[PDB]
Amino acid sequence: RPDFCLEPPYTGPCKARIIRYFYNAKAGLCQTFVYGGCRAKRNNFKSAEDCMRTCGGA
């Protein structure tokens, strides 16, 4: 899994209400969060399946 999978979820400075997924490295799986709609960081996926495919590790 890429190192970016260990960053905490980043909502960003915008105030839209976009449900995304991030990988939670302590939990070992992806959880939802409200993305504000700008300035995303890489641990930010449109589905749990994409999030796990990228971060769920070897």
Side-chain angles (χ1 to χ4, degrees), residues 6-25:
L6 307 181
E7 309 168 308
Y10 177 82
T11 289
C14 292
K15 301 286 174 182
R17 294 179 291 266
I18 299 178
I19 308 302
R20 292 288 180 80
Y21 286 81
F22 69 101
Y23 180 76
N24 177 354

Side-chain angles (χ1 to χ4, degrees), residues 15-55:
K15 301 286 174 182
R17 294 179 291 266
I18 299 178
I19 308 302
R20 292 288 180 80
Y21 286 81
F22 69 101
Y23 180 76
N24 177 354
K26 288 181 174 62
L29 51 65
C30 294
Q31 295 175 160
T32 50
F33 75 114
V34 179
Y35 174 44
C38 71
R39 313 305 189 189
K41 281 190 171 163
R42 284 201 88 172
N43 191 8
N44 183 316
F45 304 87
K46 288 169 210 184
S47 73
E49 291 90 343
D50 275 3
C51 176
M52 286 299 289
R53 178 149 39 237
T54 305
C55 289

